Design a binder for this molecule. Sequence first.
Ligand SMILES: [Zn+2]
Ligand SMILES: [Zn+2]
Length: 459
Amino acid sequence: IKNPWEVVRQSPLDDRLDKLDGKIPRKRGAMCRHGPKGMCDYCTPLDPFNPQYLEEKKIKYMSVHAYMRKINSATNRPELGSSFIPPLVEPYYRVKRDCPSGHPQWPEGICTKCQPSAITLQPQPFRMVDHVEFASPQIIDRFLDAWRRTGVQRLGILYGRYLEYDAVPLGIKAVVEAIYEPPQVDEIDGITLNPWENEQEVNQVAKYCGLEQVGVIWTDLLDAGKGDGSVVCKRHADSYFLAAQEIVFAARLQAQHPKPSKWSDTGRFGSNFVTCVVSGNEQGEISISAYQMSNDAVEMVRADIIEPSADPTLMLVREETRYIPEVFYRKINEYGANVLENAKPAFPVEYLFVTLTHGFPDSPSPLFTDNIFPIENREYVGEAQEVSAVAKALKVHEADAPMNVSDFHLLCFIHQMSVLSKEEEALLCRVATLHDLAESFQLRSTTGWQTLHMILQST
Ligand SMILES: [Zn+2]
Ligand SMILES: [Zn+2]
């Protein structure tokens, strides 16, 4: 029937990027001997994956689209149809499903044709997402307020959207518009997550805003003790940048957020879920570091093959409900040759993640402009969400004031109140994100809006 790569719906971003070759144009050079409109082998456009170009621009990884261009013939496209061969294969390091060999299924039998092949951990040369752009520093500042006033760490879920990142060939960036802080118990050196009961409701609200979960963020901050805001630099070469347990956590998260792809044999390939860590840099400044767990790491966590060791820089391969194949990791000796080492019983974590760049936009134009509502799950800091906070934010007794509803947490709380219908709530979120005066007026005319205001006036 229809294959997986035929029925999956990609994002508009992926649809746009599929049509680009990403070739980097070039001008005449010192070795070119032709006119301003001729061409030779020294001025031909470069591939998006040209190693020399990426090295020259200090680009550590090529975009996943450039990687696809590299490994795939340009004629092989889904448009061909039945003759299309998806070039992307998502790692599968588990026993194969529905083995027609004769032996019983995995837990009771196994032949050489259904056992997984030997794993070879090499550094991933591509990254699904290339950049993490925060729409405004106020987002991170409001997030870190939790730690500033408590001294304990904090975790949040990044809500936003994916866009083209032009600074790198065929790049992609996650634009973060808000940080939702889910239920948790925070300590000076750890975070325990509690059941996120309303995750689907928050997802619905974000969808009304044209947003989605794009990653996770957490803090590893510790005041240096100089009364100047400086923090301790605890993540560095001589320690770690991501702990094995953190890598497993982020890998599980990525596995739960697969990216649909019309170029994969299974319709999905990799994940756009990014991971951000706020901590001290070599200058004692609060800074961000963006990462993504490799697809091999995600598959190994999917296969329950690895687990954290007592050393945060080392990952254990679990011993013999699961199958442990050969696991090597690749190194280079002093002679320059490639060497395969046995990753068992423990191997370095450096092979399990890739690094992303991050920043704020030139001139921020964020979707959510108003900070007028307490953030969720902050009772432990005396910050509680109440209907009175809604009445205050909506300035319900000051009829002469302008509408200010551009706050994601306010939108989530209002969704919780369950007063506006789906159409009314969609209009509210559209007004919050796009700020169209005519649509604000239209919202003020709705029956749900007036019901909400009558409710709010009686508190
Ligand atoms: Zn030339
Ligand atoms: Zn078999």
